[PDB]
Nucleic acid binder design. Structure first.
Ligand SMILES: Nc1ccn([C@H]2CC[C@@H](COP(=O)(O)OP(=O)(O)OP(=O)(O)O)O2)c(=O)n1
Ligand SMILES: [Mg+2]
Ligand SMILES: [Mg+2]
Length: 324
DNA sequence: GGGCGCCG
DNA sequence: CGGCGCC
């Protein structure tokens, strides 16, 4: 029965291609949107020119409409049958360590399932191995109360080695969310500052410590600044493996760090992006005027997150507000 | 946007 | 050493 059936069908097929074969969210979005609106319409759609009228649809859609009208065809649309690589690839990407590039290669060699991975372990680099090892684990968000305990344990043991050590937990957590992807933690130490730019050792000790207590349980990397690894809560008879990140910022550049580690990522993007519009360039370490020629001037002093915002002419926004 | 570590 | 995956 349904008049515009035929069309809406196409339309929807179309959006999902746009959705997957691309990023083309904007496209896909109008796409469905439209199919939706033509769909609510109570008259048979005859002319694409009629369609246009209806809100949601426009030129580009109306065209696609036409080509369908005369002939069920849609050469573009016919093209579609290319399929399957794309489904599987992305999937693989869900694997921590697996980027689009290693995902491709993995698919080309026929590895393109979860099951398959497990079978082709030998092809995986270490990180991948882990992502793979703790796969199901990595898909669960940490709940507030958990982080809590973790905040605790980190907090504590940090003190034991030195109580001069400062540890702040950023990212989601700090922005107040109810569930957090991982645990992100800023670490600082006054012995360490913009003048020395050394002491990998501080971080170093600390991971070993947590390590030596069965907290961290794996290691994805260990720089003289960064640190990503797995960790886990304890119990009697167990808690899911979590992703952990430590970053050591020279005690003197704590604020740039804090801002940056709090995110959100989008926020940072907009913000950093903005500093520029204003003439300064911001990194986890500093905010320094950015010179006429296009080179970084000396770094403006910072005494609190507020000041960063003051510089780019922006209203301070609480962490909980830095969503974007 | 701006940058850290590891791959091979 | 680039480039990758990640933050
Ligand atoms: N591409 C990125 C990623 C992060 N940052 C910052 C934002 C905070 C931290 C990223 O931590 P994530 O754990 O990626 O984000 P989150 O806020 O912790 O989110 P989740 O809930 O997923 O852990 O690095 C940035 O400037 N650019
Ligand atoms: Mg987080
Ligand atoms: Mg993280």
């Amino acid at each position: 029965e349904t008049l515009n059936g035929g069309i809406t069908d196409m339309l929807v097929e179309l959006a999902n291609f746009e959705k997957n074969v691309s990023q083309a969210i904007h496209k896909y979005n109008a796409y469905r949107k439209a199919a939706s609106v033509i769909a609510k319409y109570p008259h048979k759609i005859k002319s694409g020119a009629e369609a246009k009228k209806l809100p949601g649809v426009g030129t580009k859609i109306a065209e696609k409409i036409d080509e369908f009208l005369a002939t069920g065809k849609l050469r573009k649309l016919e093209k579609i049958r290319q399929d399957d690589t794309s489904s599987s690839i992305n999937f693989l990407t869900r694997v921590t360590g697996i980027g689009p590039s290693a995902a491709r290669k993995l698919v080309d060699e026929g590895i393109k399932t979860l099951e398959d991975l497990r079978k082709n372990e030998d092809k995986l680099n270490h990180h991948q191995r882990i992502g793979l090892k703790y796969f199901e684990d990595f898909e669960k968000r940490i709940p507030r109360e958990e982080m809590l305990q973790m905040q605790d344990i980190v907090l504590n043991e940090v003190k034991k080695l030195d109580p001069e050590y400062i540890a702040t937990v950023c990212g989601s957590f700090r922005r107040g969310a109810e569930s957090s992807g991982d645990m992100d933690v800023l670490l600082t130490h006054p012995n360490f500052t913009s003048e020395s730019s050394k002491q990998p050792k501080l971080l170093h000790r600390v991971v070993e410590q947590l390590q030596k207590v069965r907290f961290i349980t794996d290691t994805l990397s260990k720089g003289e600044t960064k640190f990503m690894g797995v960790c886990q809560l304890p119990s009697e008879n167990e808690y899911p493996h979590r992703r952990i990140d430590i970053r050591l910022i020279p005690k003197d550049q704590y604020y740039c760090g804090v801002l940056y580690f709090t995110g959100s990522d989008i926020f940072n993007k907009n913000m950093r992006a903005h500093a520029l519009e204003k003439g300064f360039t911001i990194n986890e370490y500093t905010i320094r005027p950015l010179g006429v020629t296009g080179v970084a001037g000396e770094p403006l002093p910072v005494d609190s997150e507020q000041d960063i915002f003051d510089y780019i002419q922006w209203r301070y926004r609480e962490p909980k507000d830095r969503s974007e």
